[PDB]
Amino acid sequence: GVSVITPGTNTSNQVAVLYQDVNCTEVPSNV
Amino acid sequence: KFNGLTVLPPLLTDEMIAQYTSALLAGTITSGWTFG
Numbered sequence: 784g785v786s787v788i789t790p791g792t793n794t795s796n797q798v799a800v801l802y803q804d805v806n807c808t809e810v811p812s813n814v
Numbered sequence: 815k816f817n818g819l820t821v822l823p824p825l826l827t828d829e830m831i832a833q834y835t836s837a838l839l840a841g842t843i844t845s846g847w848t849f850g
């Protein structure tokens with residue numbers, strides 16, 4: 784699955800993304 | 815590791831929960847019921 788982490792649109796529009804139990808070398812900065 | 819089925823990990827690890835119980839146990843051996 785894919786989850787989106789947001790501080791709330793009333794604070795910022797930046798976002799982080801969690802790819803659940805996926806090895807981070809096969810996803811397609813901060814990784 | 816199946817077809818559409820996944821298992822999510824718990825937020826507290828087992829190390830964290832053992833830390834919590836050792837803090838409770840050191841509170842009671844040493845202060846009685848005053849820390850609660």
Ligand SMILES: *[C@@H]1O[C@H](CO)[C@@H](O)[C@H](O)[C@H]1NC(C)=O
Binds near residue numbers: 793794
């Ligand atoms: C939400 O927005 C209102 C007005 O724009 C502001 O007063 C409030 O503090 C905001 N909430 C947060 C959690 O930033």
Ligand SMILES: *[C@@H]1O[C@H](CO)[C@@H](O)[C@H](O)[C@H]1NC(C)=O
Binds near residue numbers: 806807808
């Ligand atoms: C992802 O794959 C690399 C290449 O084999 C491996 O070194 C790494 O340990 C893997 N990720 C995890 C969390 O084990």
